[PDB]
């Protein structure tokens, strides 16, 4: 989509991976903001907005 | 209420652990009061800040 | 300390910073006192295909 009509897809319950997501060479920028890449697969959050 | 003297030296000790009990709950500028839900979602090169 | 690393993972030589270089290949501690100098080199070692 565009920037000014950007999707919001709402994740729900679910056992998120962020394994795989940060250890593979295709992502140019992974800038995290708040949290560390390295911490998110210990930590449960409530929502999280895409 | 003629013990008086007595009893406002016991609710200002009160008083003033309370207030220094409270202030364990602020922010000072951080992200999180709790310094365990700080070391759970940072790093040290960005936690010591 | 002589080494050669490609591009972007050159800039990825920092105290307290994450990536690819960092991780594996060669840390920096967050207490570097030091300097980092890198040059570009390709008509040096940049060979056919």
């Known amino acids: 989509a565009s920037v000014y009509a950007w999707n919001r897809k709402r994740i729900s319950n679910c056992v998120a991976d962020y394994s795989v997501l940060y250890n593979s060479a295709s992502f140019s920028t992974f800038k995290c903001y708040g949290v560390s890449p390295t911490k998110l697969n210990d930590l449960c959050f409530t929502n999280v907005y895409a | 209420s003629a013990l008086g003297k007595l009893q406002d030296v016991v609710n ?30 940072l790093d040290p090169p960005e936690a010591e800040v | ?13 920092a105290p307290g910073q994450t990536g690819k270089i960092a991780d594996y290949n060669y840390k920096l501690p967050d207490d570097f006192t030091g300097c980092v100098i890198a040059w570009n080199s390709n008509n040096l070692d940049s060979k056919v295909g």
Do not use: C, W, Y
């Open chain 2, 12 to 41: 200002q000790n009160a008083q003033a652990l309370n207030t220094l009990v409270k202030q364990l709950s602020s922010n000072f500028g951080a992200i999180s009061s709790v310094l365990n839900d700080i070391l759970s979602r």
């Open chain 3, 1 to 13: 300390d002589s080494f050669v690393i490609r591009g972007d993972e050159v800039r990825q030589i």
